Amino acid sequence: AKKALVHKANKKPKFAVRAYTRCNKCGRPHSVYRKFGLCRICLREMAHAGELPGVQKSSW
Amino acid sequence: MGQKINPHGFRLGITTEWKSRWYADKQYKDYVKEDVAIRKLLATGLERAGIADVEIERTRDRVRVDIHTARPGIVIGRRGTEADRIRADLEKLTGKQVQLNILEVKNPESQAQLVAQGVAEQLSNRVAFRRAMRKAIQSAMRQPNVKGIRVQCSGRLGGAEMSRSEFYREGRVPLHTLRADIDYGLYEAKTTFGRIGVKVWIYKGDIVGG
Amino acid sequence: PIQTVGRRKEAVVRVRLVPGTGQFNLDGRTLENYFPNKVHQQLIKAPLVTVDRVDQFDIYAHLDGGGPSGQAGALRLAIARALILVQPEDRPALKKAGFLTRDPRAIERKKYGLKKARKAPQYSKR
Amino acid sequence: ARLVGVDLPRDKRMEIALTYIYGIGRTRSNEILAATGIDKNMRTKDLTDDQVTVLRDYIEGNLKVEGDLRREVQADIRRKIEIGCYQGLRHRRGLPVRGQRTKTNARTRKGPKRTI
Amino acid sequence: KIRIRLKAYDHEAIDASARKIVETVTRTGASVVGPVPLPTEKNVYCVIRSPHKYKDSREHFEMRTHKRLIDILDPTPKTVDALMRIDLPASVDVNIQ
Amino acid sequence: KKGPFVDDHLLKKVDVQNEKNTKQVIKTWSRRSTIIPDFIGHTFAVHDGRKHVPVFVTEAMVGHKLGEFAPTRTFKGH
Amino acid sequence: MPRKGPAPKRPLVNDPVYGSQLVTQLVNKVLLEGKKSLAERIVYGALEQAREKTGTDPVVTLKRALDNVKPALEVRSRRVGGATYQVPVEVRPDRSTTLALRWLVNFSRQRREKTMVERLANEILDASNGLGASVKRREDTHKMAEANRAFAHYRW
RNA sequence: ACUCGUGAGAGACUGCCGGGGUCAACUCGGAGGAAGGUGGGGAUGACGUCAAGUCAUCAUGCCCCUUAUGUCCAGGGCUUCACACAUGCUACAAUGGCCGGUACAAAGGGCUGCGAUGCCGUGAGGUGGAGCGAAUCCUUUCAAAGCCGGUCUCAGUUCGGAUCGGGGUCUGCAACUCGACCCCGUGAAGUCGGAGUCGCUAGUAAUCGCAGAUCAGCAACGCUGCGGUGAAUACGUUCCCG
């Protein structure tokens, strides 16, 4: 999560395989989700603070 | 250690409402990204101002950013000069147009977030920490209508090497009860020796109000 | 007429009744060709054997869900509550033998950190 | 019976009796016995020498067997071990060739175990 | 026909919103199908709840999507104006098909 | 099985090398293709990252991609 | 459900073809896992092969083999003071039926017939005459019980 | 009308009868009832512990680099292998293998995505685009184990699929080091596993497929879930463990 890599994953890559997800809030490269664009830690803290609309803690 | 779930995230289905509210299919990751950069943009000057809540309602791509604070007068300086600057920068950073509503809490000392604000901002200011808390309370204990409180402070307290946690309270703060209406706020003091993370639980009442 | 819903594990059956000499219509099939196991054949006709109207009264059933055996036990239930819906004085004789009471046993939720529900990963502490 | 070079057993069906040759498995038995016309259910005791003739001429004519396959491959493995490939290096050192796991498993290439 | 399919996160806000649509079109006067519950969709997301190694001891966050349906038959433009005129909760997105 | 790779930089260089009938040791980055049999006879300095290994290309090399006539790992064990 | 007292057990339905508690219980102890229907095909086919080799009611042959393998005393492994004592204890009825059916199935499973049906048929027949290995395990269990009669006093 | 879908509501409270209870709590049986006594499972981790984990999610005090300990790219490595451990998967066969016929799920997923009938292949797939932002279209009307039938006759085998050779397809600028899948051949160890040890008390164990997230592709036998078929035993606290 260095600013060269946080910034480098947002440019247009020179090949299409080279574009990867990289969670927006912190820049964490592994364990990023597609619907949120947030890693598991930012999903857990933001979903705990009610900041994400309607994802809530599960129990079936 | 204490594996205590964030109670605003433990009652966010039942009592406490979401802070951000919309509907989004295939636009959701963009709305998340704008929500994040808005809250970072409202961190600094409003954390000087006394910010407590940042709600973002979002209609058909306009936006509605609403802030609950404790002084309309630092958020709104000269009319449009302090408001429309951060409002206009929200209009430029987002690719949208911002309708910023700003409103006051009727009592700042019974918001757990604002109690954590005043406590941690005192604790960066070299005061006695047991005096701060103990005065964190006395006030809030009161004043409205507020059936608990529980303040915990960890970190380099007083500049000591050991990271001593402290635990003061008064009344009833039941966390396992879900009809609790507990406000929770953790804000982190910034001393030269380090950061003193302050957690404040405030139990207003039994009332479901369903 | 009278119609009954019998609910077993995730199966559900809708068995109705009419008076006639013995016939059993499943989803387009006969009872001996839909249930080839001959034990479920008792497990569904046992409410008919209890209040002994095995041949006098016939079920027109439709179903959904489950597997074979969930549909079997469901159809037991629907025959049984249908036999409440024929004569209520058949009802204390059903419930006494163990009937009219669907089994609430369902496949429970898998738990995180386990191989299945109630099965820990086998640990060898050193 | 006798065939291309594999001594057939006493009592096996034809789609298994053909399989005991190096070039033939189950699917080649299902295609050879469909092309020639011998019943797959025939035992080896009940096999006809003219069926050995037509079957034998078919499967030496349109398919390869024991000597071709073996000194046949074994010319291709030594082909890639002569020219200096990396798979040649794997066949040299006695390691798995497909680039698979070498740290714990791949014991079927290293063989019997010596422990240090 | 104009068929309105509305989706949201709150069952309460979508029930009062469907009460606004039924009271609106019923107020202007038309043949309208009442609120029909299409069932849901749930997105269950399992999160390793440690900023580091604790592969066991998760917490998984669901996502409820409520889907209500109101079918509108015989549209008149005095009724069609009030559709685009007011939407009260605005956490509901309205598909007009 | 359709259009195979080709190493267009090495392709341009190789053609120039064989039009002039000149043979030169080549420091080549490319580990990815020995595409045509036009590469026969040319010496390739294959680059495993760290040094260049000279490789003669003969008729049997066709169908083996260029990098692993030079190996990248070293192992002895004792 | 131990240490709180006795726990209530599930009632077991009888057989459709033969009409016995003991046939169905033999099926549920034949059940190498998953295939109760295939367990029913093994038990039913084996008992009609017993019907072939007897010409009688198969459940009478089954209960006579079940009686001829059924033990009366079982040995324990209780350890008083640095020596392991084989302690003989009276066997309950359900425990004795369980040891009879479980020994019958397992030592049918060791026997060398081709299918499972011929194994279970020959083991129910040989246990009916008294010539299986399972009857020899009943005699070895009573050998350990009668050989260890003295330690039984603890009243345990 | 029946389901079913999702909204509101009733319903389990020792409430009703019998006995023990100090006439107290509570316990043993009975009735009604879909359910009987915290009905089943979740979500829910008190004060603290262990200087447990993480300065690599993030934030950060102090110290260090600032012509490199920053940064840009190609190639390589993270996949090496005489070993040793650990969790899994496929097995060692007849309750089985292989061929043919046939019946029943639940949940899910889908925009530069899911992609049908048809045609070309043996098959991965190719050509083509019906139709769907989806209780509608597509994932075939959805399964597999099941049942009916035939064959195999106990064997290192019609068990077992590792390995290796040839031949392909698809994804991608690119499958050499290092992808998966299909076809033909090849056909090893392995005959239920020493001391030891692990899981589980009812829709559980065991076994059987299915979907999902991450993802262009996949090392997925993983993880999270969904349903199908479905047991045995618990005499009881002497012993081991907390």
Of B6, B19, B36, the CB nearest to A24: B36
Residues D53 and D15 in one domain: yes
- Which CATH code fits F1-78? 3.30.860.10
Distance CA(C15)–CA(C10), nearest Å, equals: 16
What domain range is D12 assigned to? 1-71
Distance CA(G28)–CA(G31), nearest Å, equals: 5
Residues D38 and D83 in one domain: no
Q: Parse chain A into domains and list their residue ranges.
A: 1-60
Distance CA(G75)–CA(G152), nearest Å, equals: 9
User: Which of B71, B64, B10, B22 is CA-nearest to residue B46?
Assistant: B71
- Does F touch A (3+ CB pairs < 8 Å)? no
Cβ distance E93 to B23 less than 8 Å, yes or no, reads yes
Q: Beta strand pairing status for B166-169 and B150-153?
A: antiparallel
Output the CA–CA distances (angstroms, integers) from residue G125 to B140, B170, G43, G58, G59, in the order listed. Answer: 87, 80, 13, 10, 12
User: Which of E75, E72, E91 is CA-nearest to residue E22?
Assistant: E72
Which chains have 3 or more CB–CB distances shorter than 8 Å to chain C? E, G
G146: left (phi over 0), alpha (psi -120 to 50) or beta: alpha
Q: What distance in Å separates residue B31's CA from the closest CA in chain A?
A: 9
User: Which of F63, F45, F57 is CA-nearest to residue F1?
Assistant: F63
Helix (H) or strand (E) holding E41: strand E36-42
CB C74 within 8 A of CB C12: yes
G153: left (phi over 0), alpha (psi -120 to 50) or beta: alpha
Residue B72 burial (C-beta neighbours within 10 Å; 0-12, 13-18, 19+): middle
Distance CA(F21)–CA(A11), nearest Å, equals: 44
CB F35 within 8 A of CB F11: yes
Q: Which of G10, G12, G13 to mutate to test the interface with C (most CBs of C within 10 A)?
A: G13
Provide the domain count of chain D: 2
Torsion from C-alpha of D77, D79, D85, D87, nearest 10 degrees? -10
Cβ distance C38 to G11 less than 8 Å, yes or no, reads no
Residue D81 belongs to domain with CATH number: 4.10.910.10
Distance CA(B160)–CA(D102), nearest Å, equals: 53
* Backbone phi and psi for residue B200, each to the nearest 5 degrees, phi listed first: -130, 120
The token duo for F29 is: 């980055």
Domains of chain C are 1-126 (3.30.230.10)
Helix, strand, coil abundance in chain A, percent, nearest 5: 30, 10, 60
Helix (H) or strand (E) holding D75: helix D66-82
Return the CATH architecture of domain A1-60: Irregular (4.10)
CB A37 within 8 A of CB E39: no
Distance CA(B56)–CA(B67), nearest Å, equals: 9
- Does A touch E (3+ CB pairs < 8 Å)? yes
CB G65 within 8 A of CB G107: no
Size of interface A-B (CB pairs under 8 A): 53
B-chain CB neighbours of A25 within 8 Å are: 36
The technique is cryo-EM
Residue E80 burial (C-beta neighbours within 10 Å; 0-12, 13-18, 19+): middle
Which chains have 3 or more CB–CB distances shorter than 8 Å to chain E? A, B, C
Query: Cα–chain-centroid distance for residue E53?
Result: 39
Q: Which of B3, B4, B10, B12 to mutate to test the interface with A (most CBs of A within 10 A)?
A: B12
Q: Which of B8, B14, B25, B36 to mutate to test the interface with A (most CBs of A within 10 A)?
A: B36
Q: How many CA atoms lie within 13 A of G121 on its CB side?
A: 19
Give the count of beta carbons closer than 10 Å to the beta carbon of residue B127. 13
CB A29 within 8 A of CB A1: yes
Residues D22 and D47 in one domain: yes
Q: What distance in Å separates residue A10's CA from the closest CA in chain B?
A: 13
User: Which of B31, B3, E13, E62 is CA-nearest to residue A47?
Assistant: E62
> Which residues sit opposite G84 in a β-bridge?
G79
C23: helix, strand or coil: coil
C-chain CB neighbours of G40 within 8 Å are: 37-39
Residues 6+ apart with CB under 8 A from B112: B182, B183, B184, B185, B200, B201, B202
Cβ distance D83 to F71 less than 8 Å, yes or no, reads no
Residues 6+ apart with CB under 8 A from B169: B148, B149, B150, B151
Residues 6+ apart with CB under 8 A from D5: D21, D65, D66, D67
Residues 6+ apart with CB under 8 A from B32: A24, A36, A37, A38, A52
Distance CA(B173)–CA(B167), nearest Å, equals: 13
Which positions of chain H lie under 7 Å from any protein Cβ? 1-8, 31-35, 39-50, 52-54, 56-62, 70-88, 94-96, 103-109, 111-112, 133-136, 143-148, 151-154, 157-158, 162-166, 168-170, 172-179, 183-188, 197-208, 213-216, 223-239
Length of chain G: 156
Any alpha helices (H) in F6-74, and if so which ranges? 8-19
Residue with tokens 């009278």, as numbered in its chain: C2
- Which CATH code fits B107-209? 3.30.1140.32
Distance CA(D57)–CA(D40), nearest Å, equals: 18
Distance CA(F60)–CA(D34), nearest Å, equals: 39
E-chain CB neighbours of A54 within 8 Å are: 9, 63-65
Find which nucleotide's C1' atom is closest to C117's CA.
H204
One-letter identity of residue B52: A
Which of residues 31 through 50 in chain G touch C, CB cutoff 8 A? 37, 40
Cβ distance E91 to B25 less than 8 Å, yes or no, reads no
Distance CA(E34)–CA(D108), nearest Å, equals: 70
Find which nucleotide's C1' atom is closest to A22's CA.
H57
Q: What distance in Å separates residue C37's CA from the closest CA in chain G?
A: 7
The token duo for B11 is: 């009652």
Interchain contact C1–E (C-beta under 8 A)? no
Any alpha helices (H) in chain C, and if so which ranges? 31-34, 40-50, 68-84, 91-97
One-letter identity of residue A38: L
User: Which of B104, B98, B90, B119 is CA-nearest to residue B185?
Assistant: B119
- How many Å is the maximal CA-CA distance in chain A? 45
C24-43: burial string, b at 16+ Cβ within 10 Å, e else: bebeeeebeebbebebbbbb
Q: Parse chain G into domains and list their residue ranges.
A: 21-148
- Which CATH code fits B17-106? 3.30.300.20
**Which amino acid residue lies closest to nucleotide H232, measuring CA to C1'?**
G29
B99: left (phi over 0), alpha (psi -120 to 50) or beta: beta
User: Which of B79, B122, B124, B126 is CA-nearest to residue B100?
Assistant: B79
Residues D26 and D7 in one domain: yes
CB E36 within 8 A of CB E70: yes
Interchain contact A52–B (C-beta under 8 A)? yes
Give the CATH H-level superfamily of domain G21-148: Ribosomal protein S7/S5 (1.10.455.10)
Size of interface C-E (CB pairs under 8 A): 8
Distance CA(C118)–CA(C114), nearest Å, equals: 7
